[PDB]
Design a binder for this molecule. Structure first.
Ligand SMILES: [Zn+2]
Lengths: 129, 226, 122, 98, 324
RNA sequence: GCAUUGCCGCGAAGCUACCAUCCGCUGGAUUAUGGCUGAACGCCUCUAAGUCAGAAUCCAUGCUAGAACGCGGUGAU
């Protein structure tokens, strides 16, 4: 079972990271001791630029996609269907492709506007003289 | 009908086992003597399921359910959870509970109609009990004890409480239950009656050290003889 | 995580505040080492503050919170917020009716009665 | 209204006889055939009910491409995936991708 | 024991397992090169233990397995003074790795190693076939001469290693004929070793004290991984298409594009070291021997730092796009 | 010009650690000693027949080293 890092949002694995449990039984997994010591100092990941609290709070990547509707922890279990398994495998591969495509094309929106503002700003370095 | 049973040189029964009308949950640890003991009792009528809950032999305190539903905590792994879903039929509902505490057999005691809960449970689990189990929910302490399952054993036959329960408290609580109550000892003086024994509407299973007066109490209030 | 001479919390509702361990039951014998308690360990512990009836008397107590990161069998390193123990008999039958705070999974697997009085497991 | 619930398969079950040449086999009965107490191994995959018994031998996968399979497996994935593919046909023929 | 250093860095096999002549003719050991260590998730099937049907995480050691090739044989006859080889038999075409092994100054030698031996197949084989029939006739026990495909390995030494292997199949004549067909051909461990095999490891440990021959026994093989598999790092649970190679590769070693053996526990010696994998000297039946393990997940992250991904596709999927 | 690694945040690599992990409870014959059944002596007894345990004793097996003045096979000269 893959969990996220509490401080990175990075996938936590067996053997990887430290868990802290408060008195209210809330488990917090950290992928590394940088995350763990950052939590020890009571720091905000919204302050640290590299972690995904800042990046999903900032708008570098898209954060809501219609591809995200498929990944969710389900508390009611489903009986075993072998025939749904390969369809879910194809779904995971295809949806990860579509997510990377939408993320790259979302970054493709960012780089075009600097051309426009560089045009508008190098007009200011010409038209004054 | 009351059968003394032992698990790994321990008289505790509801710790390692979970008994409803329609199924039984057993641990995988130690030996198949305790499982064959229930096979002698229950047999082919209801499915008896070996399980762990987040890698535990302790499952009756971890789980709280009726004939219609079964509630499992957050830490239940989905391999175990899929094995429980493939194990138990469509008539039994299974759902993980996202809440602070994990132990459910201490915190929720129920039958097919009425559940007593931890009076300081969150409201979401108080929703989910009456949703899945289809039972009536009451915030209540048995003699001021906030763990309601280990200190009070329930079925649709009747109920059994620990001996520190006042008779005023027994009537106060049996008005909510509409099934009778007896202050009872189990396993030679152990007040923990919910983990010391399990019961459903045709069977009560307890430890070896549950004495014959205690067995007469259980056989009377849960009507083990027809 | 706790050697001999360690103050730990009291998570049952008996009335003690803190439990001071003076001996560890079932520890090895090596020169200059300390008998170290951990999760799922019954040790002799004395009550420092609380009711004086529980004070000035040692009691056996099982540790439910450790706060030092151990290696569980499934891959995880994890530790509680603090150190905590609950006092009981040598038979493992609890004194407290309800044990507050999170109780360790190995400790509740070890003792059936502690799990019978456990409210919060992990 | 409330009733004690005992199914008819419970009453219809014969009582187990501890001294019987012809009786139901317990777990100790299958256990004592191949070895004894500790060395016997429990089978879980054989017992539980499924739509196909060959699916008893089949294997639930856990991790695909660094993602959990359990978070993605769902009743009726197909209608969601087809609506998703229609959305991607839309974002294609708008010319959004270049 | 007095701690004097090892004689050769390739440690000697002083004892081989017992000859069964009712089994087909097959090897008894192997020489590989240890790449490194990682962590494996699997389920424990141990009734009597509380950890039965429970996920365990286990340290393993992986040894790179290039396919080994047979170039000769050696028959030993019994004397009242001990074992003695009456002769050794070579094949004709031997690599520059092996001809390098005989030489100290290969870079400036005229490379004249087995020239006139190649004239012994210029004939019909009369002396050679006389020697083969002699080892059929005499020489009760048979050892074969094998060397590794060290050019298929990230080792900087182009000089491969030669070793003897006692051949515990049946029929000394069929043994030497088996080796006769297997001259200059290859043998993989898949025909020799298998899954769940309890093996012993013979290796020279890490010098710094150290550099001593050590035989650590009873190690269960966990994966006989094939070189052509791109799902080397995969399981029926771990459906990623990934190799056994770590993220960034094995530290100070390189990679494994070859076959490999992932075996339980630890092992004497370091990385880049020649290690002999021998099958067990007896049929262990401890239930730690009989265990048919079933893996779940393979760590393939970086040990060059605190790793956080398994595949780089996972890395790009989480981190998204970058400025670069 | 300095702080005996000036301090600190976060980290490598190596060494090391039941503080972390893995592997190794090798088999026979024996001495003293402790016994069994059991007569010789109708009680009785470890002994006379036989036999059980038991020393670092002896052998086997495995491991480590290899006669630097032990040996063999094989290559080219
Ligand atoms: Zn992190």
């Amino acid at each position: 079972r893959i969990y996220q890092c509490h401080f990175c949002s990075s996938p936590c694995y067996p053997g990887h990271g430290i868990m802290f449990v408060r008195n209210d039984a809330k488990e917090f997994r950290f992928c590394r001791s940088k995350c763990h010591k950052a939590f020890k100092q009571r720091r905000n990941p919204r302050k640290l630029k590299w972690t995904k609290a800042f990046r999903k709070a900032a708008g570098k990547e898209l954060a809501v996609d219609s591809t995200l509707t498929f990944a969710q922890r389900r508390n009611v279990p489903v009986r075993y269907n072998r025939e749904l398994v390969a369809t879910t495998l194809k779904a995971m591969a295809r949806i990860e492709e579509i997510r990377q495509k939408r993320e790259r094309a979302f970054y493709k929106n960012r780089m075009r506007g600097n051309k426009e503002k560089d045009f508008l700003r190098d007009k200011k370095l010409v038209e004054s003289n | 009908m009351a059968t003394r049973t032992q698990f790994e040189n321990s008289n505790e029964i509801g710790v390692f086992s979970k008994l409803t009308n329609t199924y039984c949950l057993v641990a995988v640890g130690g030996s198949e003597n305790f499982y064959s003991a229930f096979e002698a009792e229950l047999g082919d009528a209801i499915p008896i399921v070996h399980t762990t809950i987040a890698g535990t032999r302790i499952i009756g305190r971890m789980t709280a359910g009726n004939r219609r539903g079964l509630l499992v905590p957050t830490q239940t792994t989905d391999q175990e959870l899929q094995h429980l879903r493939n194990s138990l039929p469509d008539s039994v509902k299974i759902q993980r509970v996202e809440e602070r505490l994990s132990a459910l057999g201490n915190v929720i005691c129920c039958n097919d109609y009425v559940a007593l809960v931890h009076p300081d449970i969150d409201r979401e689990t108080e929703e989910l009990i009456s949703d899945v189990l289809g039972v009536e929910v009451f915030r209540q302490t048995i003699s001021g004890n906030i763990l309601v399952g280990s200190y009070c054993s329930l079925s649709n036959q009747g109920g059994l409480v620990h001996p520190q329960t006042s008779v005023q408290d027994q009537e106060e609580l049996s008005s909510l239950l509409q099934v009778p109550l007896v202050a009872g000892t189990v396993n030679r003086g152990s007040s923990v009656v919910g983990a010391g024994m399990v019961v459903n509407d045709y069977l009560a299973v307890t430890g070896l050290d549950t004495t014959a007066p205690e067995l007469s109490v259980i056989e009377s209030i849960f009507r083990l003889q027809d | 995580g706790l050697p001999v001479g360690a103050i730990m919390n009291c998570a049952d509702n008996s009335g003690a505040r803190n439990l001071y361990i003076i001996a560890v039951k079932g520890s090895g014998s090596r020169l200059n080492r300390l008998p170290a308690a951990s999760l799922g360990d019954m040790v002799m512990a004395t009550v420092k503050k609380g009711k004086p009836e529980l004070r000035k008397k040692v009691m056996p107590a099982i540790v439910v919170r450790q706060a030092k990161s151990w290696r569980r069998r499934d891959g995880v390193f994890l530790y509680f917020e603090d150190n905590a123990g609950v006092i009981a008999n040598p038979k493992g039958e609890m004194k407290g009716s309800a044990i507050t705070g999170p109780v360790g999974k190995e400790c509740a697997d070890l003792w059936p009665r502690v799990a019978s009085n456990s409210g919060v497991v992990v | 209204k409330r009733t004690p619930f005992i199914p008819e398969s419970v009453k219809n079950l014969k009582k187990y006889d501890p001294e019987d040449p012809n009786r139901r086999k317990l777990a100790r009965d299958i256990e004592a055939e191949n070895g004894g107490a500790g060395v016997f191994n429990v089978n879980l995959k054989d017992k539980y009910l499924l739509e196909d018994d060959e699916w008893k031998n089949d294997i639930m996968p856990e991790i695909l491409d660094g993602k959990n399979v359990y978070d993605f497996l769902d009743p009726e994935i197909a209608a969601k995936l087809q609506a998703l593919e229609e959305e991607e046909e839309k974002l294609e023929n708008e010319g959004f991708y270049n | 024991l007095p701690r004097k250093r090892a004689a050769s860095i390739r440690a000697r096999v002083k004892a081989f397992p017992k000859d069964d002549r009712s089994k087909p003719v097959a090897l008894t050991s192997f020489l590989g090169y240890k790449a490194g260590m990682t962590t494996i998730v699997r389920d424990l099937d141990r009734p009597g233990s509380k950890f039965h049907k429970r996920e365990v995480v286990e340290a393993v050691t992986v040894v790179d397995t290039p396919p080994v090739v047979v170039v000769g044989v050696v028959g030993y006859v019994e004397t009242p003074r001990g074992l003695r080889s009456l002769t050794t038999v070579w094949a004709e075409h031997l690599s520059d790795e092996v001809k390098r092994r005989f030489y100290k100054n290969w870079y400036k030698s005229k490379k004249k190693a087995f020239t006139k031996y190649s004239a012994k197949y210029a004939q019909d084989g009369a002396g050679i076939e006389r020697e083969l029939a002699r080892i059929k006739k005499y020489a009760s026990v048979v050892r074969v001469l094998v060397h590794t495909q060290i050019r298929k390995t990230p080792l900087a030494q182009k000089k491969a290693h030669l070793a003897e292997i006692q051949l515990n199949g049946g029929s000394i004549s069929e043994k030497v004929d088996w080796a006769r067909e297997h001259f200059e051909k290859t043998v993989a461990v898949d025909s020799v070793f298998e899954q769940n095999e309890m093996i012993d490891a013979i290796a020279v440990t890490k010098g710094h004290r150290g550099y001593h021959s050590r035989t650590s026994i009873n190690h269960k093989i966990y994966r006989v991984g094939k070189g052509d598999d791109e799902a080397n790092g995969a399981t029926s649970f771990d459906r990623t298409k990934k190799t056994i190679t770590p993220m960034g590769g094995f530290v100070h070693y390189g990679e494994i594009k070859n076959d490999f053996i992932m075996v339980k526990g630890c092992i004497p010696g370091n990385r880049k070291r020649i290690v002999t994998l021998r099958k067990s000297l007896y049929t262990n039946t401890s239930r730690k021997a009989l265990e048919e393990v079933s893996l779940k997940w393979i760590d393939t992250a970086s040990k060059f730092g605190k790793g956080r991904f398994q595949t780089p596709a996972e890395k790009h999927a989480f981190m998204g796009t970058l400025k670069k």
